[PDB]
C-alpha cells in the first residue's frame, strides 16, 4: 500500500511538475472550454480536476492501478463526479461514450522512457482522440550534455581524505573506487547543477505525440546525434540525459515548457547519468560528438536501455551499452 | 558489480560517529593491546587493524572473505605496516592463524543490530581463536526500545490537506488513505529520529555479551525482553523505535535518536493505526529479535504491546511549498 502512496505523493509534491501541468491546462481554456478530455493514467485525478477548472464539460479519468479508488474519492470530494468520471482499468480496454477533444496525461518516466505511460497515451490517441485533437503536453524533447560530476569527484577523492581525518592512508582505494563506480553499465539517476555541465546542452530528439508511427519508432529506438565543445579543462566522467515536455497554446513561439534540466529547478526526475569506464581529461574547446539511442530493454520492453556512441577529440570512437 | 563493495565501506568510514568511536575504543585500550595479538574479523579495508597497530599490537591478523581483501593488503603496505598487520583471505571459519589471539576487533553490526550482521562469524572466532578472557572490541551490545510519535510521518500525512490551498484541489481524503498504508504494513522501517519523536524514557530490554559461548544458540531462539515506560505527554502514538549501542571496555557507540546520528539510523515498528496517549500513559510489552524463518540472516521482530488499559496486541515485523 505504501508504495502507491509514495509514487503519487512524490508526483504531486513535485511543485515544478504540478504547477507546470496546472498552467499548461488552464492556459488552454479556449481549447478545453465546453469540450471533452481523456486523462490517461489519471492517478489521483488532479489533472482531470485542472481540466474541469479550465471549463471542460466532460473528463474521463482512466487509471489502471488501485489508486483509481482514491481518484474517485478526490473527484467526489471536489463535487465533480458528474463531469469527471474516473474509469478503472487500462486505457486499451476501457470503453468511452465518445471520442474526446483533448488528451491529458502525466506519462514521463526516468530518462523519459523508463516505465513510461507513453505507449498507452499513443493507443488512446489512435483509439479515442478526434482528428486534430489536442494533446497535453504535445511533445517531448531530449537533451544531452557532457558532465564532470562533482558528487563523483567527492566520492573518488574521499579515499585520499582518510589519512588527514583518521590517520590511515587509503589513497590506494581511489584507483579501486574509480574502476568500480564507473565500470558498471547502469544508468544512474541523480540530480546535477550547472557546475557539472561541461558543454552547452544539445537537443538530440523531439517526440511529437500526434505522429502516427511514433510507437513503431519507440520499438526501433528513439535517439539522435550531437556535437559540442567543452567549456574548459576538467575530467570528463560521462553524459547527462534529461527531457522537457512542451504544452501548446498561450504563445506559438514561446509555449509553456516543463524541464528536468540541471540548469532549471529540480524535479523528482532529476537526470539520467551515463558514466564512461574511466575519466577522460578534456580541455577548453575539446570537441565531443556521438549518438544516443533510447531503447526498450530486450528482456523487459518497459525497462529503459541507452546505447551511447561517443568520440572525444583525438581519441577513437567508443561505445557503451547502459540499462536502467 | 563493483560499486556495491566500495559504497558499503565508503558508508562505514564516512560515518564519523561510528569510525571515531571504533578508533577511540581501540586506541584507549593501548595498555591491553601493547605487545599483544589481535584478530580483525571482516577487516574489509583494514582500517581497524591499523588502529590496533597504532595502539601497540605486536601483530594483527586481518581476515576478510570478500574481494576487498586485496585492497586491505595494499592499505597495510601503503601504511608501512606489512610487518605487523597480515591480511588473510577467506572466511574466519576456515582461516588458519599461527596462534590464538589476545583480542578480537570487528565491525559487525547490522540494521536493527542483527539484520544481516557478522555476529555469528565473530562468535565463531571467539570460540576458535580468542584466548581466555581475551579483549573484545566491542564486547557487548545493548538493545533499547521507546514509543514514538514520528514527526516525519505526520508531516507526510499532513501534506494532502495542504493541496487545496495551493492548487485549488481538495485532497484531504488522501490523509486517511496514506495513514492506513504507511502504517498497516508489517515491515521494519529504517529511519532516523530525534528527541522530539521519543514519547517516553527509552528502555533497555536486552544485552548481548560477545564472550559467552552459547550466545549463538540463544540468538537462534531469539533475544529480547520485557519493557515498561510512562509517556511524556499528549501525542499520537505511532509505534516503537528499536536501536542499539555497543560498549568498548575502558566507552559506548550509540545509535539512539537522542545521540548524534549514524548510518544505522533506528528501526521503526509502526502500529496499524495511531493510538492517542497522554502524560503518564503506561506502555508495556515484549520485544524479540528473531532470525526470519525464510532467511536466518534476515531480521524479524515480534512485538507484543499494551497501551493503558487497552487490550494487549501483537504485531510481527520483518526486514510543503
Q: Where are the domains of chain B?
A: 1-138, 140-321
Helix boundaries (H) for A55-108? 68-77
Q: How many C-beta neighbours within 10 Å does residue A25 have?
A: 27
Annotation-wise, does A303 bind a ligand? no
Buried b (16+ CB within 10 A) or exposed e, B15-39: bebbbebbbebbeebeebbeebbbb
CB B149 within 8 Å of CB B236: yes
Which amino acids of A are annotated catalytic? 106, 115
Q: Residue A14 in 3-state DSSP?
A: coil
Query: CA–CA separation, A282 vs B10, rounded Å?
Result: 28
- Whether A184 and B5 lie within 8 Å, measured CB to CB: no
Which of A171, A163, A183 lies closest to A278 in space, CA to CA?
A: A183
Beta strands per DSSP E along chain B: 37-41, 59-64, 85-89, 101-105, 130-137, 140-148, 189-191, 203-209, 223-230, 235-247, 252-254, 266-277, 282-291, 299-307, 313-318
Which of A275, A247, A248, A274 lies closest to A259 in space, CA to CA?
A: A247
- CB of B172 within 8 Å of a chain A CB? The answer is yes
Edge-to-edge strands, sheet with A58-63: A84-88, A58-63, A36-40, A100-105, A129-136
CB B267 within 8 Å of CB B242: yes
Tell whether the torsion through CA atoms of A315, A316, A320 and B2 is positive or negative: negative
- CB of B161 within 8 Å of a chain A CB? The answer is no
Crossing angle of the two packed helices B16-27 and B3-14, in degrees rounded to 10: 70
Set of cell numbers at residue B29: 585500550
CB A294 within 8 Å of CB A221: yes
CB B281 within 8 Å of CB B58: no
Tell whether the torsion through CA atoms of B197, B203, B204 and B205 is positive or negative: negative
Query: Strand B85-89 relative to strand B59-64: parallel, antiparallel, unpaired?
Result: parallel
Query: CA–CA separation, A284 vs B20, rounded Å?
Result: 42
The resolution of the experimental structure, rounded to one decimal in Å, is: 2.4
Please, which residues bridge with residue A236 across strands? A280
Q: How far is B10 from chain A (nearest CA, A)?
A: 8
Residues 6+ apart with CB under 8 A from A302: A114, A115, A116, A296
Q: Phi, psi (5° rounding) for residue A323?
A: -150, 155
- CB of A145 within 8 Å of a chain B CB? The answer is no
Set of cell numbers at residue A148: 564532470
- CB-nearest to B1 from A5, A155, A184 is A184
Edge-to-edge strands, sheet with A318-323: A222-229, A287-296, A304-312, A318-323
Query: CA–CA separation, B255 vs B245, rounded Å?
Result: 6
Query: CA–CA separation, B137 vs A182, rounded Å?
Result: 35
CB A128 within 8 Å of CB A96: yes
Which of A2, A7, A16, A3 lies closest to A264 in space, CA to CA?
A: A16
Buried b (16+ CB within 10 A) or exposed e, A3-23: ebbeebbebbbbebbbebbbe
Torsion of CA B272, B277, B281, B284, to 10 degrees: 10
Please, which residues bridge with residue B198 across strands? B148
Q: How many C-beta neighbours within 10 Å does residue B279 have?
A: 10
Polymer length in residues for chain B: 321
Residues 6+ apart with CB under 8 A from B126: B104, B134, B136, B210, B211, B213
Q: In what helix (H) or strand (E) does residue A235 lie, and over which residues does it extend?
A: strand A234-247
Q: Prior bond to A172 cis, omega within 30? A: no
State the number of CA atoms in the 13 A half-sphere of A249 facing the CB.
19
Residues 6+ apart with CB under 8 A from A40: A62, A91, A103, A104, A105, A107, A117, A120, A121, A124
CB-CB neighbors (< 8 A) of A177 in chain B: 6, 10
- The nearest alpha carbon in chain A to B21 belongs to A166
Which of A153, A198, A160, A197 lies closest to A178 in space, CA to CA?
A: A153
Catalytic residue among B11, B82, B116, B209: B116
Q: In what helix (H) or strand (E) does residue A280 lie, and over which residues does it extend?
A: strand A271-282
Experimental method: X-ray
Which of B93, B218, B235 lies closest to B151 in space, CA to CA?
A: B235
B96 belongs to the catalytic site: no
Query: CA–CA separation, B10 vs A78, rounded Å?
Result: 50
Residue linked to cell 603496505: B77
Residue linked to cell 476501457: A94
Please, which residues bridge with residue A234 across strands? A282
Buried b (16+ CB within 10 A) or exposed e, B93-113: eebebeeebbbbbbbbbbbbb
- Whether B185 and A1 lie within 8 Å, measured CB to CB: yes
Q: In what helix (H) or strand (E) does residue A321 lie, and over which residues does it extend?
A: strand A318-323
Query: CA–CA separation, A63 vs A37, rounded Å?
Result: 14
End-to-end CA distance of chain B: 39
Query: CA–CA separation, B27 vs B134, rounded Å?
Result: 16
CB-CB neighbors (< 8 A) of B47 in chain A: 162, 166, 168, 170
Query: CA–CA separation, B110 vs B33, rounded Å?
Result: 26
CB A259 within 8 Å of CB A271: no
- Whether B185 and A70 lie within 8 Å, measured CB to CB: no
Enter the DSSP assignment of A8.
H
DSSP A124-170: HHHHHEEEEEEEES-EEEEEEEEE--HHHHHHHHGGGGHHHHHS---
Q: Prior bond to A63 cis, omega within 30? A: no
Please, which residues bridge with residue A229 across strands? A287
Chain Cα centroid distance, residue B302: 17
Query: Strand A318-323 relative to strand A304-312: parallel, antiparallel, unpaired?
Result: antiparallel
CB B72 within 8 Å of CB B62: yes
- CB of B80 within 8 Å of a chain A CB? The answer is no
Query: CA–CA separation, B280 vs B25, rounded Å?
Result: 38
Which of B272, B258, B303, B301 lies closest to B111 in space, CA to CA?
A: B301
- CB of A78 within 8 Å of a chain B CB? The answer is yes
Residue linked to cell 505526520: B154
Torsion of CA A115, A119, A125, A128, to 10 degrees: -90
- Whether B167 and A74 lie within 8 Å, measured CB to CB: no
Query: CA–CA separation, B194 vs B260, rounded Å?
Result: 9
Distances (CA, A) of A192 to A53, A261, A281: 35, 8, 20
Residue from A173, A184, A186, A266 whose CB has the most chain B CBs within 10 Å, to mutate: A173
Which of A109, A131, A129 lies closest to A118 in space, CA to CA?
A: A109
Residue linked to cell 506559438: A252
- The nearest alpha carbon in chain A to B48 belongs to A168
Distances (CA, A) of B154 to B150, B157, B159: 7, 5, 9
- Whether B13 and A166 lie within 8 Å, measured CB to CB: yes
Distances (CA, A) of A28 to A104, A132, A210: 11, 15, 17
Tell whether the torsion through CA atoms of B87, B88, B92 and B96 is positive or negative: negative
Please, which residues bridge with residue B313 across strands? B305
Chain Cα centroid distance, residue B39: 22
Query: CA–CA separation, B21 vs B254, rounded Å?
Result: 9
Q: In what helix (H) or strand (E) does residue B220 lie, and over which residues does it extend?
A: helix B215-221
State the number of CA atoms in the 13 A half-sphere of A177 facing the CB.
21
- CB of B191 within 8 Å of a chain A CB? The answer is no
Burial class from Cβ neighbours inside 10 Å (0-12, 13-18, 19+) for residue B310 reads exposed
How many Å is the Cα radius of gyration of chain B? 22
Which of A115, A268, A317, A295 lies closest to A205 in space, CA to CA?
A: A295
- The nearest alpha carbon in chain B to A161 belongs to B14
Query: CA–CA separation, B4 vs B9, rounded Å?
Result: 9
Query: CA–CA separation, B210 vs B138, rounded Å?
Result: 8
Enter the DSSP assignment of A249.
S
Please, which residues bridge with residue B244 across strands? B143
Distances (CA, A) of A296 to A114, A116, A292, A304, B17: 8, 11, 13, 5, 44
- Whether B177 and A22 lie within 8 Å, measured CB to CB: no
Distances (CA, A) of A170 to A31, A217, A301, B92: 63, 49, 43, 24
Q: How far is A47 from chain B (nearest CA, A)?
A: 10
Query: CA–CA separation, A207 vs A143, rounded Å?
Result: 12
Torsion of CA A189, A191, A195, A201, to 10 degrees: 70
- CB of B27 within 8 Å of a chain A CB? The answer is no
State the number of CA atoms in the 13 A half-sphere of B44 facing the CB.
20
Amino acid at each position: 500500500c505504501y508504495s502507491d502512496v509514495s509514487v503519487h505523493e512524490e508526483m504531486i509534491a513535485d511543485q515544478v511538475r504540478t504547477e507546470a501541468y496546472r498552467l499548461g491546462i488552464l492556459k488552454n481554456w479556449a481549447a478545453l472550454r465546453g469540450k471533452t478530455v481523456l486523462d490517461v493514467g489519471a492517478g489521483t485525478g488532479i489533472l482531470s480536476i485542472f481540466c474541469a477548472q479550465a471549463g471542460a464539460r466532460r473528463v474521463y479519468a482512466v487509471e489502471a492501478s488501485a489508486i483509481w479508488q482514491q481518484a474517485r474519492e478526490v473527484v467526489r470530494l471536489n463535487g465533480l463526479e458528474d463531469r469527471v468520471h474516473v474509469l478503472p482499468g487500462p486505457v486499451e480496454t476501457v470503453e468511452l461514450p465518445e471520442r474526446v477533444d483533448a488528451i491529458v496525461s502525466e506519462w514521463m518516466g526516468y530518462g523519459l522512457l523508463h516505465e513510461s505511460m507513453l505507449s498507452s497515451v499513443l493507443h488512446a490517441r489512435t483509439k479515442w482522440l478526434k482528428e486534430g485533437g489536442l494533446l497535453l503536453p504535445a511533445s517531448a524533447e531530449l537533451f544531452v550534455a557532457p558532465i564532470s560530476d562533482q558528487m563523483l569527484e567527492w566520492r573518488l577523492g574521499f579515499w585520499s581524505q582518510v589519512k588527514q581525518h583518521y590517520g590511515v592512508d587509503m589513497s590506494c582505494m581511489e584507483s579501486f573506487a574509480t574502476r568500480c563506480l564507473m565500470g558498471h553499465s547502469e544508468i544512474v539517476v541523480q540530480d546535477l547543477s550547472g557546475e557539472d555541465v561541461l558543454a552547452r546542452p544539445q537537443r538530440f530528439a523531439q517526440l511529437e505525440l500526434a505522429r502516427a508511427g511514433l510507437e513503431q519508432e519507440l520499438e526501433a529506438g528513439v535517439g539522435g546525434r550531437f556535437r559540442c565543445s567543452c567549456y574548459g579543462s576538467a575530467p570528463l566522467h560521462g553524459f547527462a540525459v534529461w527531457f522537457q515536455v512542451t504544452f501548446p497554446g498561450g504563445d506559438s513561439e514561446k509555449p509553456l515548457v516543463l524541464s528536468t534540466s540541471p540548469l532549471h529547478p529540480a524535479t523528482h526526475w532529476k537526470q539520467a547519468l551515463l558514466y564512461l569506464n574511466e575519466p577522460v581529461p578534456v580541455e577548453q574547446d575539446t570537441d565531443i560528438s556521438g549518438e544516443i539511442t533510447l531503447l526498450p530493454s530486450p528482456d523487459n520492453p518497459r525497462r529503459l536501455r541507452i546505447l551511447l556512441r561517443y568520440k572525444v577529440g583525438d581519441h577513437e570512437e567508443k561505445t557503451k551499452d547502459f540499462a536502467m
